[PDB]
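Section: Multi-chain targets

For targets with more than one molecule, the full set of components is provided together so that the structure can be written out for the assembly as a whole rather than chain by chain. Components appear in the order listed by the source. The example entry contains three components.
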Amino acid sequence: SIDPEKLRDQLLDAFENKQNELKSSKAYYDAERRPDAIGLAVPLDMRKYLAHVGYPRTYVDAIAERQELEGFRIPSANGEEPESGGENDPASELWDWWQANNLDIEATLGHTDALIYGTAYITISMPDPEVDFDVDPEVPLIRVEPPTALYAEVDPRTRKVLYAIRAIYGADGNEIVSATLYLPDTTMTWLRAEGEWEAPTSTPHGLEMVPVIPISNRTRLSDLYGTSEISPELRSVTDAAAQILMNMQGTANLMAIPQRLIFGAKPEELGINAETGQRMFDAYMARILAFEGGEGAHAEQFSAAELRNFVDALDALDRKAASYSGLPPQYLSSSSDNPASAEAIKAAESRLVKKVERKNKIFGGAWEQAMRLAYKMVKGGDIPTEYYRMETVWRDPSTPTYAAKADAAAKLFANGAGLIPRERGWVDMGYTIVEREQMRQWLEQDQKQG
Amino acid sequence: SIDPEKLRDQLLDAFENKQNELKSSKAYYDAERRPDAIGLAVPLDMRKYLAHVGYPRTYVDAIAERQELEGFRIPSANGEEPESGGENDPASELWDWWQANNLDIEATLGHTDALIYGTAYITISMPDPEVDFDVDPEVPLIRVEPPTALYAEVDPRTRKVLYAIRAIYGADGNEIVSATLYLPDTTMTWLRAEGEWEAPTSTPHGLEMVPVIPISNRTRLSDLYGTSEISPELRSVTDAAAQILMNMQGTANLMAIPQRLIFGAKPEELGINAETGQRMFDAYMARILAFEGGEGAHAEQFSAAELRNFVDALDALDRKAASYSGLPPQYLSSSSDNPASAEAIKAAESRLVKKVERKNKIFGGAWEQAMRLAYKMVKGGDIPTEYYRMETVWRDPSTPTYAAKADAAAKLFANGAGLIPRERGWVDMGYTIVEREQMRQWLEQDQKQG
Amino acid sequence: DMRKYLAHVGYPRTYVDAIAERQELEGFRIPSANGEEPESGGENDPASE
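Its structure, encoded as tokens over all components, is:
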């Protein structure tokens, strides 16, 4: 074993060493300055005019904003007929804790950090009564915390957490203001900076396990810890397009104009003011200049640069950024078409839908595990064996074509004489578990009237 | 612990130092002068003719104008929903307070500051009969107030507000005319109307928490205080396009026409006046000039600058600003195809609608806390535990399509034989909570007629 | 001498008119006493006053 006094210092070093990697992925989503984004042709005083490219934010938002949780399924004993009535089902308890914590806000935030940095953590406890918070005392306190504020050590053998630590910085600056340890046996916390530390506040803990569950963006089994969604291909076209935008911008300031010259005309004959090198001439539009013609003088000009030449590369890098991201080609530099039919929308979005349906699986596992820990912690003792088959249920990531579903669900149900039972029509219309519940009350109330 | 007069001064200095940040985000929404917006190629005399670019205001308004609140929703014992209507159910008190404060006017207004600056604050109080002569004395007085007039210190430990201060400037903006402290259990107010601070008025409020709540534009968990919606990439394309407009306009004023030259002709042979360097000649259209034209004299030109060279860069930067913002392409690109059908509308708006649905989740979390604090201040004691499961219900951000919804809802209801109960068809048609309450009474008055 | 030929541009007129010509009030709603929301113009009510 190791002392809790040492278990800060031993892995706050690892917490700080993590921040050097996280800062790389942040620069792409926050659209910060990068050496690789600076366009090389622009002269060194004009290089202050950074151009930033929104592909990383566009891709991470297009995933993160389409996923939402409807509820949980827990397989009942004696057949799939559970209900929220007297002696209510397991799922209506876990959904009450989801609502009472506002996890429908904290999850949609925390999935964004999980996509940017590759992981985020779900923290479980009872609420402390002594701090007077706006929380129901009877529910487990569940909240999501970013990898910028929390760290965990994962066992290489079993791939489950051994140790975890929060570090909370001051309102500005690099100084810590609180740190907290999670261990299987206990949670412990400190309320001052590095040096001047308080004595440990401590809480004894009911689980065999650390009450910190990693959400992680595992693309693949050989991702041990999850990986940033802002892939090296998408970074490459972001930095490449930023250079084309800066060089185009420099060209518009320096060369989109033809530069006009006269050769063989003596500065003395033109009446150039010798101490400034310039002659002003009164230049309203139609006037004709006439010269003595010097040493057999003539006019010349350097031609303008074609700004179109850079735009033909901006379009090509947009075409690559769409292909790597799998966004519908109406996003980014918009294509010469828009999907004008309910089927053509599913044709355009099919990649983005299947990537969000894939994220809904790998984040579902972390939420199911956190709900088992929250139950085992608040109810105490054992977990009922059916909770090992618990599944999250998520909204369809596609744009809801309501009228195209309504014709189809009506033709299938056919006033009760048709192919499907009433509740399957309600599922296919995409009504959430809480809506399909309340429609039973309205349908029973309609059946009093006929 | 801290002296209120010291704690008033100590964070008036913090409220003031924050204004040096907010003036940057204001400059993009107002379209103030920026150094980065000035097109470099125009000569010093013409840099006065600034071009102001509207992408930031176009984006922030396009979100803020689609957000609206229909009403609150709260659970109940045994699943007993409210029925027949017009009685004070748990949510109808909260909606009466929303109406009585005109928050339907003030909230959509204050969400604009929450998107521009990244935060705005909800201030909660009881009416003062000596000052608040224009309000119902029985409702809590709830106001939304900008970060240019209120400041608050959140604890990075557990995210509660510890302290907050209003400061009001006089109509000239030279000095503070009043300040107010919101402490956890009491409020204090000072005046400066004819000199330095008078002794404070005060009001105990006895709540466990400060009656100031931040609305914040939380981008992700790591974005602790929320950030401006006018992101660094949308700033950089706004300033880039403003330079192109100044260079194009300066080129039109000075070089969009040929410059006409004659070489080898002596000014004295042309009869050019020696006091002024000019000769006027009558220039009605078809007149032919003739010159003695010795020693290889000839006419020639400099080319016009081709203004469509800059327009090919404006078109490219419009595709970038549309890409970064996620607006429909017809807001910015403008020449692009208008959506021809209800499904094409749901495709083109898809990313803007999904962005507004995200803001409805995030800002809804602050308005439910305002209603919990308002209930605690009006009724006293502790909240009925159902209020921790409160939900804000918002208008669908989608551009309406009443004909397609009517074709669908009629096919699903099938004159009462169909798939869904009558009240669900009213929800799917988008009739708001306060309007379904009227239909539920007109339907009964129609039922008495047969 | 030709700068007397002013070129007046109508975007501000066009924008302010295209808002102002859409705005039209068509009544006031006052919520009824005791939850009895239906009232009608055959007798005096707060809306009609």
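Chains C and A do not touch (no CB pair under 8 Å).
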